[PDB]
Amino acid sequence: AIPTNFTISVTTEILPVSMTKTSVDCTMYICGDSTECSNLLLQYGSFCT
Amino acid sequence: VGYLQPRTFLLKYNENGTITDAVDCALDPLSETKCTLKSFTVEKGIYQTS
């Protein structure tokens, strides 16, 4: 079976390339503006880094 | 005469046990990045501080 005519077709492909960049202030999230909580949290600085 | 305040300092001990240098971690953003990296030397770049 041999084709006798043709068709020219255009199709689309969608690909993700990047995502949102985020940063966290560890003390702001855990303690807010409490000085006492920050003095207590000074024992966990390595984990936030 | 000067007056003391509660501060966080990064002190340096040499191989004989004497304090030879210090960083005041809340003077400048540069000092804050020094304090975070735990080094007295900072390489070229952009750093998030606080």
Add this chain to the structure above:
Amino acid sequence: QFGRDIADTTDAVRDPQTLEILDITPCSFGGVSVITPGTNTSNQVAVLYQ
């Protein structure tokens, strides 16, 4: 007497004298970054307030 948001923190209060409702807002906000060419080269820096 008190109002609380989704995070459960208190954000509104009735004044016990004048009986008026007041909103409470934190006063620490906004991100900061520091640009350095390297402490080896120089101590001059730039600061970006986002």
